[model samples]
Target: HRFETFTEEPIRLIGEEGEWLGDFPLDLEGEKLRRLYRDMLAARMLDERYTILIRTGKTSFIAPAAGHEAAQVAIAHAIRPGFDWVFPYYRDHGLALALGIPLKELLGQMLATKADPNKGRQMPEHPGSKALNFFTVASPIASHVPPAAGAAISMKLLRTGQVAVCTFGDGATSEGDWYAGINFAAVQGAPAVFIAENNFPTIADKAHAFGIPGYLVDGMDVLASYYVVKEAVERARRGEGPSLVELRVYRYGPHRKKDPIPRFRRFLEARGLWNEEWEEDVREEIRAELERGLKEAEEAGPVPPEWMFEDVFAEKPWHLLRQEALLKEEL
Candidate 1:
C-alpha cells in the first residue's frame, strides 16, 4: 500500500509545463479523468453561484471553495465512501460536493429552505448527508475533531473496518481540541486519516508528521494527491493507527492566479486526455444540474421562524415555548 517515498519530495506526477512525471502509472483513464475534471469545475461553479447568492442577499453568507477543488476531490476519492465517515467544517462544500452530496442539499443548505434535511438550522455551507456518512458540519472551528476521534475509536472497538477522514483549516490545528483528538487517536492507534490543507509544512520535513506517519504531496497534481492519501487510508485499514496526508495548497486566493482545474486540464491535455469540446460538454452538464438544483431550492420555500423551535428539542422547555409563542405572534 505504500507508494514509493517521494514523501520527502512533494510527490508530483505532473508539472506546470504539463509533462507527466512518468512513473506511478497513470491509471485514472478515460471517463475517470474526465469525471475528476467535471467535479473540479462543478466545485468552481458552486463557489461562484454562492458568491452571487450572498451578494444578492439570497443567502446570509458563503465561504468560497474555488481553489481547493483538487485537494477536496482527491480527499473524497481517497476514502471508502459510505464505509468511511467525513467530519467537515463550514468550508467543505467542495468536499461535500466531491463526496456526492446532492446539489439539492447543497443549494437548500445555503438557502435555508424546507428542502434541507436538517431543517435549515445551519447557515450556508454547513452540509451533512447521512446517506453519505458525512457528519453535519459545524461552523465552530475544530469542535468536530473530538467527535471524529470518538467515531474512529468506536470503529476500532467494533472492528467495523471503517475510517474517519476529518479536515480542517490551518488555524484549527492550534485549537487544543485538535491536539487532544489527534493525541488520543495516536495513543489508541485508532483507524483514521486526518488532513489539513492550510498548514505550514513544506514538502515532508513534517516531523509533526511528528506523531504518525505523514505524507506530503503536491496539491496541484491530482494523481499524486490521490496516491499518497490512498497509501495512508490503506495503511489505516490495516490497523496501522492514523496518518496525516498534507496536501499543500494556497488558501488566501490563488498563489499565482492559478486554478487546479486548468492546471489539471493542462496536464490531461498534454496526454490527449482533455479537449475544449469535452470541457464544454462537462460544463453544460453541470449547468443543467445547477439550474435544476437552484430551482428546487427556490421552490422549497423559506424556512419559517417556527422551524427554529421544532428542531431544538423534542419538546420545548417553558422558556422556549414562550419564545415560540411570542415569535408566532410576531409572525
Candidate 2:
C-alpha cells in the first residue's frame, strides 16, 4: 500500500501477533527479511553489552538503545552509507553498527582505546567515522542540526547528489537550532532529512509549517519505519526538500517495555523465517563478534596522554604547551 503522509494513527505494517498488515505484497526476499531480523537482534545484543561495559567499569556512561533497534536498523538499511551523511545523536550505536561501522571501532570509541578512530576524544556512545561520513555526535541537544543542514546545503550547491540524514531525540525538537536548521534546509531545498526518535509525536505535525511532508510511523515496526524513511530519502534524492519523520519508540531502560527485538523476531517467525535453531545460531555468532571486538579494543589500551594536545588546536597555545610539558614530565 502507498504510505500516506501525516496519518492520524502511526503507520504500521506488522500486527502485534507478527502478522503482515500492509496492503502491498511483500517484496523483500527471505534472506533480506531474515537479515533485517538478525540486524535487530544484533542491536539488542549490543545494548546488552553496553550493560556489561558499565558494570565492569569499561565505560562510565551508557545511553542504551535497546528498544529502539527496529527504527535504528531500518534507517541504517534505508540509507546508502558513506554516500549519504548521517548526523547521529548519542543513543545511536545501533544505527552506527548497522551502517557498517566495525564493532571494534565502536567498542574502542566507548572504551577510549587506541582502536577508536576519534582517538578517544569523545565520550562513550558517541560513535562516528569519517570514512563512513557518520558525523561524530555532540552532547548539546539539537546542536548538530545546523551543521547537518549546512552539509546538505553544500551537497546541493556542489551537486553531490547526497542527502544528510540527522537523527535526534524528541527534546531536541524544541531547540531553536532545530527550527533554524530545518528552516534553512527547507528554504534552500537542501537534501536534509530529520528523524526524531521520540519517546513520547507532535514532531511529525511540525512539518506543516515547512511545506514538506512529515510522517509519523511505528518505529517499532521495522518495515513501516524502513519504507517511510526510504520514501523520504528517495524524495530528497529527487531534489524535493527535507522531510521530518517522528518514530514512536519506547526505550527499554527505566521501565518494563515491549522489546522491539522479540517483537520483530515473532514477525519473522510467523512468516516461517525464524526458528529456535536459527535464533541460537545468530546469537552465538553475534556474541562471538562482540567478544572479538572487546578483545581488540582492550588490547589497544588507553589513549596516549599526549593525544589531548594534538587535536584541540591548530597550533598549541602557550598555556596548553606548558600543560603538555608538565604532563610529559609527570609521565
Candidate 3:
C-alpha cells in the first residue's frame, strides 16, 4: 500500500525546497498540478481580501484561513464535491472556494447581502450551500461534530455511499461533543472522516483508542494532504467506516512570511510549473475576480429586516405573519 494508517511521524510527500519525495509515481496531470497551486493562491488572496473587508468595515469578524489552504484546498479536491458532504468549521474559506462556491456568494455572506444563499442568517466565515451539501459552519467550536456524525449515520443507513468529512481546529478535540460524535460514529461504523487541522504526541495518536485509522500528514505539503485525505475518503466510501486525520500545519499569525502558499509555489518552481509571469497573471486574475465579486455583493444590498420572519418554517405560521405585519406597521 502507498499509504499506511497510524504512522508514528507525519507523512510527507514534498520537501521544503520543493522536491518531490514520494516513492510512487505521481499520476496527477501537469494542468491538475498547476490548478492546485492556483487554488492555494486564490485562497490566500481571498484571506487577504477578507482582511481588507474587515479593515474597511465591511465585515465585523473573520476566521482567517491564511496557512490553512493546503489542508483545506486538498480536502476540497479529494472528495466527490457535491456527492460527498462536508461539515466545515469557521476557518474553511479555502475549502469552500476550491469546492466551487462562487466568489460572489462568499463575499455576499461576509457582507450580509442578499447575494448570500443563506439569506444572511449567519455571520461571515459561516457559509453553507444546500446544493453543494456543504454544511453551514457554526460559531460554537465542535458543535458541528455531532451533526456531521449524524449525517454520516444517515448516509450509512440509506446506503448513499457518501462520506461525511468534517474539519475543525485542534482545540475542538477537547470538547465533549468531539468524543461523543467520534465514538458514536465509530461504534456504528459510520462513513465519516474527521480532520483535525492542528495549528500532536499529536491528534493522530488518539485514533488508536477509537479503533480507527489515524493518519498523520504534513498539512504544509499540499501533495501529502491531498493524497492522504483522498485515501481516507475512498476508504470511507468503500464502507470501511471513519478515520481521523491530523494535519500538522502552522498558521501565519503575524508571521515572518513562512506560510504554505509560498512553500508550494517553490515546489511548483522546482518542477518548472511556475514562473513570475504566471504568478503575476494569476494574482491579477484573482484580484480582478475579487473586485467583481465584491461589486456584485455590494449591489445586492443588505438583507431586509422582515427576513427574520422568513425561512423559519416551510410555511409562515399565523403568529409569525401577525408579528411581521405588526413590525412592518411599526417600521
Candidate 4:
C-alpha cells in the first residue's frame, strides 16, 4: 500500500523577522545587498503605483507581487542576467526589475504610453526587454511555457551554456501547456529552471486543491528565498538539468483591478490568521518605503516623449514612421 501525505513545510533560508536560519554564512554585501534592498523596495513601490493606477482607472489590470519580493529577487539573482533567457508571467515586474531592467522601461510598459517597449501593443501586465533576454509576457496563462522549453532545447542542441529560467504563478500549473513543457524538458534533460510562485491562494482558490504541496514561507524573508533559488540555479549551471522550484508566498491585494482586501481580511479572520496590529505595522512600513521610492523615481526626471520613435526596428518600419509623422502632426 502506498500512502501519500502532503506536508506543509516551506523551503526557507531566513526567518519571518529577517533572521537567517541555515548554517550557511551570509556572503552578500555592499552593492549586492543594496541592490537586493533597492529591487525589493522598488517592487513594493510598483505595487503601490499599480494600486493607484487601478483606482484612477489609468490601467485595466494588475496582479500584485507584494508578498513575493524575496522569491522574485532571489530568482532574478540566481540567473545570469542578459545571458540566460527568462520566460516570465504577468506578475513578474519585481523579477524583471531585479534582473536589471530599467525603471523607465518597466513604467513605460505598465503605463502603455508612447514610452513603452512593445509600442503600447500589449496590455499592462505584459513585459518585454531586449537587453535582459526576457521574453514578452503573455496573458493566456502558461502559454510561454512551451516556448521556454523550446528555448532550452535549442540551448542544448546548439551547445549554448546559457540556461532558460521560466517563472509563473501557481494557477499556471493547471494549464495543459505546463505539463507539456515540463514533460518535454524532462525527457530531453534540458537546462531549465521552472519556478512556481505559490502564493497559497491562486486568485481566490486555495492552493492545496492543486495536488502539489505548497511551501508556506514568510513572504518577507529575503534570505530564505535567495539561498533556495541560488542552489537551484547553481545546480542547473553545473549541467544538472532542470528543476521545478515552488516558492510559497502571499498577495496582500486583490486578484486584479478590484480591491479584495475587505473580503480577504474576512477570510483571514474566519481562519484565525488575522493580526490587526501586524497588518497596521506592515502598512505603515510599506507606505514609508513607497514615499522614498517615489521621490527617487520622480527625481530621475520625466521620460521623454520622443523615445517612442526609437528602437522600433533595425531602422524604422513604414507604418511606425507614418505613426510618428501623425504624432508630430497632432502634437
- Full-model lDDT, candidate 4: 0.67
Q: What tens-digit string does per-residue lDDT give for candidate 4 at 250-298?
A: 7877763211233233333443445677566656775665555444444
- For candidate 1, the TM-score is 0.91
**Prediction RMSDs, each to the true structure:** 2.5, 1.7, 1.7, 8.4
Estimate the lDDT of model 1: 0.79
Looking at model 3, residue 74 earns an lDDT score of 93
Clashing pairs in 3: none
Q: Which is better, 3 or 4, measured by lDDT?
A: 3
Say which prediction, candidate 3 or candidate 4, comes out ahead on TM-score.
3
- lDDT string, candidate 3, 1-331, tens digits: 4487778788998888888888787878888989999999999999999888999999988887788889998999899888999999989988999999998888999989999998899878889888789998888999999999999999999999899999999999989999899988888889999999888267888887789999999888899999999888888888888899999888874423547788888888988899999999999999999999999999999899999999899889999999999999988
Q: Estimate each model's TM-score.
A: 0.91, 0.95, 0.96, 0.71
Worst 10 residues of 1 by lDDT: 198-207
**1 or 2, which is superior by lDDT?**
2
Better of 1 and 4 by lDDT: 1
Candidate 1 lDDT for residue 126: 83
Query: Rank order by TM-score, top first?
Result: 3, 2, 1, 4
**Of models 1 and 3, which has the larger lDDT?**
3
Worst 10 residues of 3 by lDDT: 252-261
- Please, what is the whole-model Cα lDDT of each candidate in the order they appear? 0.79, 0.90, 0.89, 0.67
